């Protein structure tokens, strides 16, 4: 078995190898990359997502989210308070303000220490989940607005034609902005490109050990657990590396820098934080190997997780028994 310790793998494709997205994913899996839950892909040196970022300041963040924490430094939840709209230029200025800017630090490890020590005492503002793309239409390789769609993958593998669309999302981050422990909707893959700015640190649990994380989460968030049988779908809970180590949960960590892709694999729990002002683009995708994960994916039926139009069809076709109760949650 390749990669039996489930380490995060890093790939350096040539420009020739960067032509065929599906083939390269299947290559990475042949080397065991999926066992980690997360892989890094460094694009060929000749490749660019677009010519410059000089003209992005007029993008609108319609509903910036202030991430308010509750709990203890290593075990907390966050709630998202909606703020008034602002442009990316306004948000960048905010991120660079004395109140919100990255503190002085020695290296990524010192900054990671400061994040876990101090996150809960601040409420950074995240411009998340903004439909759109920053890839130039002329970028033909690994353009996250030009991928094969999940609906087309399901049709190719299973023969069934379904409604729905699959488009990317932009994330504008600042120091301390945080993504809670989660897997993707329907345990899909994700791909994330860091277009610009400061780094993003990731934590990941190997898919084969995801249920260990879930059992710990039920112990650490016991009222949430009684409220919903899949409450990590709410995307609100954080658990630090120190706490994961104290409880024997297998995980890995890596820092993504501007210009790099990350891929999360089906049922790979991940969480993380931004080091400073940045912009990422991400989208879900599927391969043939995903189908079985989609059939087995947990679902939130308490009503909190409230997800896309396109997930309807996935549930209806892959999980017809759950269909009924899950749609009661979504209506
Ligand atoms: O970048 C973020 O805030 C969150 N991104 C992801 O969870 C992802 O790409 O799967
Ligand atoms: Mg603009
Ligand atoms: Ni994700
Ligand atoms: Zn729920």
From Swiss-Prot:
<dbReference type="GO" id="GO:0005721">
    <property type="term" value="C:pericentric heterochromatin"/>
</dbReference>
<feature type="modified residue" description="PolyADP-ribosyl glutamic acid">
    <location>
        <position position="17"/>
    </location>
</feature>
<feature type="binding site">
    <location>
        <position position="235"/>
    </location>
    <ligand>
        <name>2-oxoglutarate</name>
    </ligand>
</feature>
<keyword id="KW-0560">Oxidoreductase</keyword>
<feature type="binding site">
    <location>
        <position position="228"/>
    </location>
    <ligand>
        <name>Zn(2+)</name>
    </ligand>
</feature>
<keyword id="KW-0223">Dioxygenase</keyword>
<dbReference type="GO" id="GO:0072562">
    <property type="term" value="C:blood microparticle"/>
</dbReference>
<keyword id="KW-0156">Chromatin regulator</keyword>
<dbReference type="GO" id="GO:0000724">
    <property type="term" value="P:double-strand break repair via homologous recombination"/>
</dbReference>
<feature type="binding site">
    <location>
        <position position="184"/>
    </location>
    <ligand>
        <name>Fe cation</name>
    </ligand>
</feature>
<dbReference type="GO" id="GO:0005654">
    <property type="term" value="C:nucleoplasm"/>
</dbReference>
<dbReference type="GO" id="GO:0006954">
    <property type="term" value="P:inflammatory response"/>
</dbReference>
<feature type="binding site">
    <location>
        <position position="182"/>
    </location>
    <ligand>
        <name>Fe cation</name>
    </ligand>
</feature>
<comment type="function">
    <text>Histone demethylase that specifically demethylates 'Lys-9' of histone H3, thereby playing a central role in histone code. Does not demethylate histone H3 'Lys-4', H3 'Lys-27', H3 'Lys-36' nor H4 'Lys-20'. Demethylates both di- and trimethylated H3 'Lys-9' residue, while it has no activity on monomethylated residues. Demethylation of Lys residue generates formaldehyde and succinate.</text>
</comment>
<protein>
    <recommendedName>
        <fullName>Lysine-specific demethylase 4D</fullName>
        <ecNumber>1.14.11.66</ecNumber>
    </recommendedName>
</protein>
<feature type="binding site">
    <location>
        <position position="192"/>
    </location>
    <ligand>
        <name>2-oxoglutarate</name>
    </ligand>
</feature>
<dbReference type="GO" id="GO:0140684">
    <property type="term" value="F:histone H3K9me2/H3K9me3 demethylase activity"/>
</dbReference>
<feature type="binding site">
    <location>
        <position position="126"/>
    </location>
    <ligand>
        <name>2-oxoglutarate</name>
    </ligand>
</feature>
<feature type="binding site">
    <location>
        <position position="302"/>
    </location>
    <ligand>
        <name>Zn(2+)</name>
    </ligand>
</feature>
<feature type="modified residue" description="PolyADP-ribosyl glutamic acid">
    <location>
        <position position="16"/>
    </location>
</feature>
<dbReference type="GO" id="GO:0071479">
    <property type="term" value="P:cellular response to ionizing radiation"/>
</dbReference>
<dbReference type="GO" id="GO:0032452">
    <property type="term" value="F:histone demethylase activity"/>
</dbReference>
<dbReference type="GO" id="GO:0035861">
    <property type="term" value="C:site of double-strand break"/>
</dbReference>
<dbReference type="GO" id="GO:0005634">
    <property type="term" value="C:nucleus"/>
</dbReference>
<feature type="domain" description="JmjC">
    <location>
        <begin position="136"/>
        <end position="302"/>
    </location>
</feature>
<keyword id="KW-0408">Iron</keyword>
<dbReference type="GO" id="GO:0031490">
    <property type="term" value="F:chromatin DNA binding"/>
</dbReference>
<dbReference type="GO" id="GO:0006338">
    <property type="term" value="P:chromatin remodeling"/>
</dbReference>
<dbReference type="GO" id="GO:0003684">
    <property type="term" value="F:damaged DNA binding"/>
</dbReference>
<keyword id="KW-0539">Nucleus</keyword>
<feature type="domain" description="JmjN">
    <location>
        <begin position="8"/>
        <end position="50"/>
    </location>
</feature>
<keyword id="KW-0479">Metal-binding</keyword>
<keyword id="KW-0804">Transcription</keyword>
<comment type="similarity">
    <text>Belongs to the JHDM3 histone demethylase family.</text>
</comment>
<keyword id="KW-0805">Transcription regulation</keyword>
<feature type="binding site">
    <location>
        <position position="200"/>
    </location>
    <ligand>
        <name>2-oxoglutarate</name>
    </ligand>
</feature>
<keyword id="KW-0013">ADP-ribosylation</keyword>
<keyword id="KW-0862">Zinc</keyword>
<dbReference type="GO" id="GO:0032454">
    <property type="term" value="F:histone H3K9 demethylase activity"/>
</dbReference>
<dbReference type="GO" id="GO:0000785">
    <property type="term" value="C:chromatin"/>
</dbReference>
<feature type="binding site">
    <location>
        <position position="234"/>
    </location>
    <ligand>
        <name>Zn(2+)</name>
    </ligand>
</feature>
<feature type="binding site">
    <location>
        <position position="270"/>
    </location>
    <ligand>
        <name>Fe cation</name>
    </ligand>
</feature>
